[PDB]
């Protein structure tokens, strides 16, 4: 009764072991970093989440990670 379908082997269950498909957000969160934001009137904030165009660290190790699963092994249903 699990909606998840195993991509590698349809007969077996999905590696996730879940029964409800994921819910996508209205707009996916964009990459950001916590930095200061000088207030233009002498003030300054400490942890201000500000957009970041690309990966904070462009190493192949960092960028290869998609978060779909432990090894990104979940099918398209993971997203």
């Amino acid at each position: 009764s699990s909606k998840w379908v195993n991509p590698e082997d349809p007969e077996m269950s999905h590696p996730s072991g879940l029964y409800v498909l994921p819910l996508k957000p209205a707009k996916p969160q964009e990459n950001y970093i916590y930095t200061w934001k000088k207030g233009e009137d002498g003030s300054i904030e400490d942890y201000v989440k500000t957009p970041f165009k690309g990966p904070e660290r462009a190493a192949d190790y960092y960028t290869q990670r998609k978060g779909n699963g432990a090894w990104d092994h979940w099918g398209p249903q993971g997203e």
Binding site: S1, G17, Y19, K24, Q29, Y32, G67
Partner: protein, 216 residues
Amino acid sequence: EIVVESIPRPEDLLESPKFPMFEGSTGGYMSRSTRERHAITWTAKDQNKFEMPTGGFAIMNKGENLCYFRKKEQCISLGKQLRKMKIENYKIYRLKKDGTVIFMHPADGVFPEKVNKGRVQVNGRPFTIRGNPQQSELKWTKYHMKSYEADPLTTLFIKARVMAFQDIPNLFALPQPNMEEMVPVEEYTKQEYTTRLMEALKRVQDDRKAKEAKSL
């Protein structure tokens, strides 16, 4: 039938009525270095003092409460404590970096300890624990060093092989190949070649019988 809650990203949900009244500590998730989160949402009839898995204590709001953590372990421990307090409506979600919400703990809406229809055994083995095949028997195969993952048919086949190979006196020794008769792959029927191989094997067996009967 199960509906997945919105569960906005913690960075977006700075202040919410759902969050319980808790002291705060340095045991919370590191926001600078991690992005994956786990949200636990439950409903409480009264404000019961409870201990946060991350440091200090907390007070749950009468109504809907939502908490954020870094690990499913923390979420599950909090859920166990809530169950001890008789709060059975709690749900756990995994929040990816991009906001995708995956409903995790009551995977099908029924607690795992309670049996539910539509559940099929996973990682189940049809024999006693010692029924697994010998690790040395399946070497240089799919299960080179994982005898606890061999299929039941493979286990049965390997067991039968080890029983078969005890009877040393009558075991067919594989004929030594004639390396002279080698030709290029480019240079018939599969059944016909099998039949020819069988004629060759019978000839080998007859020759072996004659050779052994010569002096015996």
